[PDB]
Amino acid sequence: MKADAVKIADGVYWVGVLDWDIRMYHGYTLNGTTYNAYLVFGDDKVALIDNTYPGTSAQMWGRIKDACEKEGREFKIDVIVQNHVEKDHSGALPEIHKKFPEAPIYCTEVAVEGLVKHFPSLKGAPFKVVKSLESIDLGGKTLTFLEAPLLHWPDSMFTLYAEEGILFSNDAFGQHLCFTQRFDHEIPENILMDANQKFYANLITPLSKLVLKKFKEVIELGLLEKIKMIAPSHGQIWTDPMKVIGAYQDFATGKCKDKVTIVYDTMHGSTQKMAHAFAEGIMSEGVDVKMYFLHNDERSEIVKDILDSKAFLLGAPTIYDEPFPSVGDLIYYLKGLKFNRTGLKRLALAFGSMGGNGGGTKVLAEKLKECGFEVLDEYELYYVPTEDELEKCYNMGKRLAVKVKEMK
Amino acid sequence: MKADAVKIADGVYWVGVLDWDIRMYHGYTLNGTTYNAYLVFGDDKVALIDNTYPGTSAQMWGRIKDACEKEGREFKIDVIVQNHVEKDHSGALPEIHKKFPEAPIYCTEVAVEGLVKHFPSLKGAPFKVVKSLESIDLGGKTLTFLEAPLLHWPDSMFTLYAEEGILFSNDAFGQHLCFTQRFDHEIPENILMDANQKFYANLITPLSKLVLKKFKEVIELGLLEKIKMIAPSHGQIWTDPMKVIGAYQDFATGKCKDKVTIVYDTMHGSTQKMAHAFAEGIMSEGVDVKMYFLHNDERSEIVKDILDSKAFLLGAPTIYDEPFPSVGDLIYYLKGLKFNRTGLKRLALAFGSMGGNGGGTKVLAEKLKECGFEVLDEYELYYVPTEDELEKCYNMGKRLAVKVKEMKT
Amino acid sequence: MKADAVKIADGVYWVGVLDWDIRMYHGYTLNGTTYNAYLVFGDDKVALIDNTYPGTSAQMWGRIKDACEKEGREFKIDVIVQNHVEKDHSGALPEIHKKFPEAPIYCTEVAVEGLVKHFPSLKGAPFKVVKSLESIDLGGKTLTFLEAPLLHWPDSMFTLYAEEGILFSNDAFGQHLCFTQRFDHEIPENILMDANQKFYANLITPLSKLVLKKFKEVIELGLLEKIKMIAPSHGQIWTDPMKVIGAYQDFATGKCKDKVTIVYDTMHGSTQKMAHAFAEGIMSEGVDVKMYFLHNDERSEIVKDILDSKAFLLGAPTIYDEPFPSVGDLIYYLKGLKFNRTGLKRLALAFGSMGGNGGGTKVLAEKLKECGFEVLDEYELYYVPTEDELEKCYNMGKRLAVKVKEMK
Amino acid sequence: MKADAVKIADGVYWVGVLDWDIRMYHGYTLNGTTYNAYLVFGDDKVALIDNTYPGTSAQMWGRIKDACEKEGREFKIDVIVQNHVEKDHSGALPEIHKKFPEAPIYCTEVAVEGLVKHFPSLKGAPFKVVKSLESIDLGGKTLTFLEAPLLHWPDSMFTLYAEEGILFSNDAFGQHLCFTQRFDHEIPENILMDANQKFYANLITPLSKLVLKKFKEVIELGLLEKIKMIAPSHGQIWTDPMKVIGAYQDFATGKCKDKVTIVYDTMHGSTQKMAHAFAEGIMSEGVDVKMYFLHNDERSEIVKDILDSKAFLLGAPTIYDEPFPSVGDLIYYLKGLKFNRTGLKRLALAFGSMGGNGGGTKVLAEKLKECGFEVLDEYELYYVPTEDELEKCYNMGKRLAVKVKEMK
Amino acid sequence: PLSKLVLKKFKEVIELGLLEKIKMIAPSHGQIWTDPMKVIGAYQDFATGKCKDKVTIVYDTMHGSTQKMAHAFAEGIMSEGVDVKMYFLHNDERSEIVKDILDSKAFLLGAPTIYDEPFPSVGDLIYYLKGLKFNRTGLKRLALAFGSMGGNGGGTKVLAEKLKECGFEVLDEYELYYVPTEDELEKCYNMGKRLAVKVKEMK
Ligand SMILES: Cc1cc2nc3c(=O)[nH]c(=O)nc-3n(C[C@H](O)[C@H](O)[C@H](O)COP(=O)(O)O)c2cc1C
Ligand SMILES: Cc1cc2nc3c(=O)[nH]c(=O)nc-3n(C[C@H](O)[C@H](O)[C@H](O)COP(=O)(O)O)c2cc1C
Ligand SMILES: Cc1cc2nc3c(=O)[nH]c(=O)nc-3n(C[C@H](O)[C@H](O)[C@H](O)COP(=O)(O)O)c2cc1C
Ligand SMILES: Cc1cc2nc3c(=O)[nH]c(=O)nc-3n(C[C@H](O)[C@H](O)[C@H](O)COP(=O)(O)O)c2cc1C
Ligand SMILES: Cc1cc2nc3c(=O)[nH]c(=O)nc-3n(C[C@H](O)[C@H](O)[C@H](O)COP(=O)(O)O)c2cc1C
Ligand SMILES: [Cl-]
Ligand SMILES: [Cl-]
Ligand SMILES: [Cl-]
Ligand SMILES: [Cl-]
Ligand SMILES: [Kr]
Ligand SMILES: [Kr]
Ligand SMILES: [Kr]
Ligand SMILES: [Kr]
Ligand SMILES: [Kr]
Ligand SMILES: [Kr]
Ligand SMILES: [Kr]
Ligand SMILES: [Kr]
Ligand SMILES: [Kr]
Ligand SMILES: [Kr]
Ligand SMILES: [Kr]
Ligand SMILES: [Kr]
Ligand SMILES: [Kr]
Ligand SMILES: [Kr]
Ligand SMILES: [Kr]
Ligand SMILES: [Kr]
Ligand SMILES: [Kr]
Ligand SMILES: [Kr]
Ligand SMILES: [Kr]
Ligand SMILES: [Kr]
Ligand SMILES: [Kr]
Ligand SMILES: [Kr]
Ligand SMILES: [Kr]
Ligand SMILES: [Kr]
Numbered sequence A, C, D: 001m002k003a004d005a006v007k008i009a010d011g012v013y014w015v016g017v018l019d020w021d022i023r024m025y026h027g028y029t030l031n032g033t034t035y036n037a038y039l040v041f042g043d044d045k046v047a048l049i050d051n052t053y054p055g056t057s058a059q060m061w062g063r064i065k066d067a068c069e070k071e072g073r074e075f076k077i078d079v080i081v082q083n084h085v086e087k088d089h090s091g092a093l094p095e096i097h098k099k100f101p102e103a104p105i106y107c108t109e110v111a112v113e114g115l116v117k118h119f120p121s122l123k124g125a126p127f128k129v130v131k132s133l134e135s136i137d138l139g140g141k142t143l144t145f146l147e148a149p150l151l152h153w154p155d156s157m158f159t160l161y162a163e164e165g166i167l168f169s170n171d172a173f174g175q176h177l178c179f180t181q182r183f184d185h186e187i188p189e190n191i192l193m194d195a196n197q198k199f200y201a202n203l204i205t206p207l208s209k210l211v212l213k214k215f216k217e218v219i220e221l222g223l224l225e226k227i228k229m230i231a232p233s234h235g236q237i238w239t240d241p242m243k244v245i246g247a248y249q250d251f252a253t254g255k256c257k258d259k260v261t262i263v264y265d266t267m268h269g270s271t272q273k274m275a276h277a278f279a280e281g282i283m284s285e286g287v288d289v290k291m292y293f294l295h296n297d298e299r300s301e302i303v304k305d306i307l308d309s310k311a312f313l314l315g316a317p318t319i320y321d322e323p324f325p326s327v328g329d330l331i332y333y334l335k336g337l338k339f340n341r342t343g344l345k346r347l348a349l350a351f352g353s354m355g356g357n358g359g360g361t362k363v364l365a366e367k368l369k370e371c372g373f374e375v376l377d378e379y380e381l382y383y384v385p386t387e388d389e390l391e392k393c394y395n396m397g398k399r400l401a402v403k404v405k406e407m408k
Numbered sequence B: 001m002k003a004d005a006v007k008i009a010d011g012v013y014w015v016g017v018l019d020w021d022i023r024m025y026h027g028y029t030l031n032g033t034t035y036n037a038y039l040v041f042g043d044d045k046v047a048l049i050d051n052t053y054p055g056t057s058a059q060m061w062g063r064i065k066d067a068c069e070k071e072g073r074e075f076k077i078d079v080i081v082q083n084h085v086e087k088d089h090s091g092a093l094p095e096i097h098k099k100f101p102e103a104p105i106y107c108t109e110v111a112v113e114g115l116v117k118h119f120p121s122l123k124g125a126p127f128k129v130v131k132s133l134e135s136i137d138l139g140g141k142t143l144t145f146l147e148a149p150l151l152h153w154p155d156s157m158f159t160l161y162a163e164e165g166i167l168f169s170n171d172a173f174g175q176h177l178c179f180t181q182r183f184d185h186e187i188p189e190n191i192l193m194d195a196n197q198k199f200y201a202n203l204i205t206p207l208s209k210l211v212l213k214k215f216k217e218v219i220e221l222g223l224l225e226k227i228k229m230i231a232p233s234h235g236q237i238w239t240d241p242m243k244v245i246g247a248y249q250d251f252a253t254g255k256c257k258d259k260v261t262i263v264y265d266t267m268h269g270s271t272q273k274m275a276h277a278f279a280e281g282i283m284s285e286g287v288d289v290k291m292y293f294l295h296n297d298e299r300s301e302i303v304k305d306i307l308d309s310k311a312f313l314l315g316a317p318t319i320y321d322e323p324f325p326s327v328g329d330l331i332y333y334l335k336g337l338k339f340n341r342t343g344l345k346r347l348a349l350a351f352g353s354m355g356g357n358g359g360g361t362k363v364l365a366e367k368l369k370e371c372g373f374e375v376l377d378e379y380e381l382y383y384v385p386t387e388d389e390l391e392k393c394y395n396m397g398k399r400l401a402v403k404v405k406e407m408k409t
Numbered sequence E: 001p002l003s004k005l006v007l008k009k010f011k012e013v014i015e016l017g018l019l020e021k022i023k024m025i026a027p028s029h030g031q032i033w034t035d036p037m038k039v040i041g042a043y044q045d046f047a048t049g050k051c052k053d054k055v056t057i058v059y060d061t062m063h064g065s066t067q068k069m070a071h072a073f074a075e076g077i078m079s080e081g082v083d084v085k086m087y088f089l090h091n092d093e094r095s096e097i098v099k100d101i102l103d104s105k106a107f108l109l110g111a112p113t114i115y116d117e118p119f120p121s122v123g124d125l126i127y128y129l130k131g132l133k134f135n136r137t138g139l140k141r142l143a144l145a146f147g148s149m150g151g152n153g154g155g156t157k158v159l160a161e162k163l164k165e166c167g168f169e170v171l172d173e174y175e176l177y178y179v180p181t182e183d184e185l186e187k188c189y190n191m192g193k194r195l196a197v198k199v200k201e202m203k
């Protein structure tokens, strides 16, 4: 395939892959994404930083050939860097190693066993284990490695091109966006920061304390102000790195809007009527609302909006003494994401309709507490809400919205 | 609209609704269903048994008018029977009451409050509370009411047209099928019994002990052999009532096949490779397999197959120390269904791939035990399975299949 | 249901409905919408302008009661205005007429028969046929009716509250957005203008000549500068009317970006490889690309992007001498939309893979011409593209992108 | 992967792949499928007949190894047969050739170029072109080839294991079913014959005249009664070959039931009300009805039911002078399938609702005629049907059902 | 019956840019066209259902009663300024009849009942119309069936069924007993008048 590389600095190219057509990626909804790989031309050695998903390398190889041609160099890679073992960034490593078998593969210690377990043909490949602050010289360009375990996997690391302050952060600071434009400043800010928020919410939330720890280490090494560009493994390249670092600082410390996310499911529409009545009460106080119906909507957008919501409402009818089962998916996901690690226990209310002994709302309230929410109340009613019962939902939403606006 | 009634006995007509186009109904997948309503012409009184979902009454009214015309009677309903309050069978009750305000509404005591809570316009309607074995005379035809609380709601009852032994069972013995054919014998048996199995699995499983209790009461009264037809609220009418009663007896007592249902989810395909390797081991012992991938498949077909499986395998990768979240939906559903109430604790294995501390399979094993399964083992491995690890999956499946064939149903 | 009205001017309220949960509306994908209805309090008469979809009136009635309470007036409607017969705006008219049977219903001549055909209970209702420039006095407030046939139905009209210059335009200038925020300035501009573009593309494109004719008529009346607010029947209220009028002028006259929309379907991935190779050639010239895969994507987003694209590529494999059948849906839609009515014949290429006699690409080229595109070339190849064939796709895309940049 | 082979005759094994999880395959909906491959152990040579989809060979290799072990033979393929080039049966040919580079590949003349175009690594592979009635000796077992062009691709052929009368028919007589049971007699007949009908409808309909021509040739060679087993490339193996040959004869000659398939789409429900009223009229005559709503349903099930229906109804509302665009997909598909090639012109009616000039129903009637249907009537009405208009739909359906019953 | 193939051949010829290049059409019968666009234009009109405000009436009779009905329908049609061509199957033959149907918006067919069937001469025209398939022109011409009878009747019901099979839009049918009365001829006139109004409403 013929495909052009994109220069991001002198002798540095994006040689990634545009996954135009993907719409679901591990339960994360998106309108395509990219697998960003980078090619650094030192005077002596050419290094490839990360690669792409298995079967998607046609664009990558085309862009690598284009970059070598633009540099007046032979089609050759001398050094391979693997920041992360997950196959969306390591999937072409078997073919890169087969093509360039003498190129060493720089990665963390735990990455070696992980990569060989993913790709058995790499057994006996020239792996070179790296540690934080160790560097390699490409000839006028230096790559410095920085271990970042559990940001987001135990094998994860960042690679810094020291002379120009370009941080190849792999997943950290990435966003699932697929545009012809490669840089942060070339697309609308709302699209960029909404995709960044969704990426943090789904991938970084349980790591919020480690984010702040990594930031303290990066500032104590005096290297924060040296970062001129962040080139992540998905989406746009940050020419304004402090914009995304600032967004991460806000998400990791529980900075939220005066906003409530409401999620519900229904069989006969009664829980839906309750959800809409809670929203009316919240809106009467000028507090924003995002409304999700689990029949149609899915977990990755829901958790994006919870991330900057001060409160979360969850509603479902009772079926055989349990809440309607679709909530189980979201609850299992919230149990993993651990929103309390942002330093904020978001307020919550459980609600629902029932037709006998009930009990679904009590289960929801207990699960919301396990997920780190501050459950203020619960409201369960019999079949179709009356006018007085919808006014109670409105009043509960109104009183919640007052508490939301009072919250620091 | 103009729509023909279907005669099911002398002076008795199906006047129901064909919901051709519905594909999802409270998370239950289907290729349409029906809302069966019945019109009984006594010499003195015409009785309507159940009705239909709100906004779907055009067919029902057309069939009622057609039946009255065929009987040489006025377009009039004298008696309304409401077997169950759920709006798929009571949704046209406000219109029926408005059209025929003097017709008494026969239902259980708890049904009255439930119907008025659903439909405020019924406040002050002529409700007539009934109890088990109470009857009403329509003139040469008798309707006898039998209370059936929690089969499937606390308001539920059956209505028996005594002289012909026609049991209007409402949801009990129903199936979500939408055909032009109205009777059990007019469609392929495999379609009928598969839909019946799906209906039991999703709606009756947690009531399995009450099913057997209701069957004991009906046998003690001597009414079991008097039932000549079962006319439920969805799908086909049973001209062979002992066929569906027999199927219910088997499902309520844990009669299963030499069959394993395997369910999994995956992000990068490793848990999928494990699932397929367990299946190969099971199949090597001549044991049947049903395979479900939670990315594409949904809870109502899964639980249909668990109902006559002797074993259930559940697999998922680990994400933030938890199993992949799609399993949470199925687990919440299985917690409600309580398959252990069938009198059998189906065998189970939990499995999955992981990339660090793991833990997802220990959560799965714990949840499977809470859902009433007999968990025999759990197997978690690191990233992509090796050949030896897929042979271990095969061997575990083979050993499970041996134990499945040793179980006596 | 208790739900607050929103004041939009002195004695004028939004009393609409938030359809939070709808995700598809006549094949148009969305994240909810609104059915905007308005209540105008004259000193003598209270007018309700449009209403909502059948079964969704709970919010509307709540907001009408709230507005009457805020005005110190009884819960009473004196005048009913029906701008458009489509049931998303007329669906509550039977229940409004039943509650207020003496309130006249103002609508166009053709609307009367259309409303009675939709709602048989309105036979004998007090209909009052209106014509362009006819007005009614509410007591200190005047409503002037302006006929807009085929903008977008034969019955359509606008209602102008003359003293404040508020144009109740019904569907015209609407957008399918459901937010707690009611005004244009309260949401991100990119979201607003993207939704406006989607609404124009799907609903207004074939009416582009009538839009320009309606604009000349409005300027000839000296009434364009007198519009201070446009309050449409869906989405945000325009406090900046010239922003949306300007967008409509651009869409109605073929003002496009240096941008190509590519649409394809595939069974075995060959047509997909071609589509991605055309994109690489286009991007090499700095021309933007939007890529759609018919397996996943749907017609309403596709036509949004065609609207401001200078070129359109359509690709599909051959099956039984015909193009893959999913293209038939999009082609039937484009035949109805008539993009040539914008005054521009967008450039086009047809492409695809085949395994025998072929012919699918020739059908695509013929259909693209029937849909008003200027078809420049066709490219059909045998099974999996070779490297030379993907370079041909790249070169064709490059040559197209040069022609796109040369267009006016 | 460890996976057992299944013996189907002395020295003959199924070594195929169970695709448990696939739900859509080129727009064909299914609950998984199989890629059947077969291993024939001659005294001198072991032949592999067909293989599997790319990336799905783990099961196949496991079963080949299991079969070789059971036969006391080396893990070695001496002969490769490729009946058809489509990648669901040829996708592992690159792997197989790389492992056994001296094994000749038997295929048709046109298959060679098709396979090398799909798989460039096969350039220079030992292809052996075969013609009809040419045979190869494996040592006590003979494989005879039989060209079957356009059944279903130009490259297609059947392979006959002469001594046992086992016809490896590739796609012909296949069904998209994925069960642990391998034979026709081991699953419920309704499931088997419904899947066989769906496979014929979607893949064989336009080839109906070639099916009857191939059956003439097979009877002229005296081979029909000698066929003891049909082992196709998907689904169950026919131990009762005359059951599927008989079904194919019926489908190829227009043998239908007293049955009408009704398909429609709707925006506001009026065309749906018409569709349901036509069904009531048809059912009043004891004629069966299958109802499809294009919003939810898809082309592959629709055409399955058209195949044994004597009549087909198609309804849609008018949008910008055209029928609702979802019909375009089904019409493009029916144009390719050419149901008139079964020797029957099925009866048809076109219907719909409209709100102005209409015209959608006239387009539907035109298109139904182009698709080979005998269009008897056309009915378009204004907005919501009245009681008299639904009685007209009922009467039209009743009259159609009388004509259906009169068709011999 | 080839009307759709005519239009497909005209698109193929226009796509090749060869239509404006034809200077003369020299066919195998009759006149040579020095004005080719005149006959191509006529073919385009016939292939797309361009008709006149005109009705073709065809009937047969034994004792004259169906003839009196036919003439009374014509009077009603003519009262609306709609043209009429009248054919009597005893004398007239199929090739002139179908010439006039081709640019008629409506077609009337009448015959008496004989042994529960329509008079047999209609069978020849019906078999011919079944082959010609006038519906292939893109127009379903309007039609009425009529006749006289002397017992159980039924001939008109058969005619209506056959007209439907030949692609016509049958609006009504009228069968009467033996010789029409003045009121029955006024009914024929009124039916023809109503038909002619619908004919003028067709575009
Ligand atoms: C299959 C099924 C099982 C139910 N089981 C229970 C139950 O165990 N306890 C209860 O209180 N209500 C039960 N209900 C009643 C529902 O909770 C009740 O209809 C409720 O009003 C539905 O709320 P919704 O309109 O939001 O779906 C059940 C309903 C269904 C359909
Ligand atoms: C977002 C994400 C989070 C993960 N978190 C964990 C974790 O907490 N513990 C663990 O052992 N593995 C974790 N993993 C690694 C996966 O379990 C591992 O990749 C596994 O092999 C996936 O199996 P599959 O191919 O069936 O998807 C995580 C993977 C992802 C994508
Ligand atoms: C069911 C089916 C029917 C086909 N019919 C034809 C045909 O009529 N003419 C043709 O040239 N190719 C035909 N093909 C071959 C495909 O066009 C060919 O495989 C093409 O390369 C598919 O491109 P894709 O990878 O983009 O799907 C057919 C393929 C299938 C699966
Ligand atoms: C966007 C749109 C465009 C329409 N265009 C036309 C048109 O060109 N001609 C027409 O007669 N009706 C037109 N209509 C009106 C519909 O055909 C009419 O509402 C019809 O009754 C819908 O039938 P349904 O309820 O089955 O969807 C249009 C409707 C919509 C929503
Ligand atoms: C041989 C013959 C057979 C007839 N059979 C019937 C018959 O089956 N049913 C009927 O209603 N009239 C029958 N008739 C009566 C004619 O239809 C009746 O005379 C009619 O008015 C003749 O119409 P005409 O004047 O247009 O010929 C028959 C007439 C003849 C001469
Ligand atoms: Cl590998
Ligand atoms: Cl009510
Ligand atoms: Cl109404
Ligand atoms: Cl290859
Ligand atoms: Kr670093
Ligand atoms: Kr590191
Ligand atoms: Kr990360
Ligand atoms: Kr980070
Ligand atoms: Kr930092
Ligand atoms: Kr950082
Ligand atoms: Kr850094
Ligand atoms: Kr009973
Ligand atoms: Kr009862
Ligand atoms: Kr039940
Ligand atoms: Kr029961
Ligand atoms: Kr029983
Ligand atoms: Kr029973
Ligand atoms: Kr009973
Ligand atoms: Kr105006
Ligand atoms: Kr107007
Ligand atoms: Kr509009
Ligand atoms: Kr406009
Ligand atoms: Kr305007
Ligand atoms: Kr205006
Ligand atoms: Kr053969
Ligand atoms: Kr075939
Ligand atoms: Kr065949
Ligand atoms: Kr055959």
Ligand SMILES: [Kr]
Pocket (backbone or CB within 6 Å): D146, D160, D167, D218, D223, D224, D227
């Ligand atoms: Kr054969």
Ligand SMILES: [Kr]
Pocket (backbone or CB within 6 Å): E006, E009
């Ligand atoms: Kr011609």
Ligand SMILES: [Kr]
Pocket (backbone or CB within 6 Å): E013
């Ligand atoms: Kr011509």
Ligand SMILES: [Kr]
Pocket (backbone or CB within 6 Å): E013, E018, E022
């Ligand atoms: Kr020509």
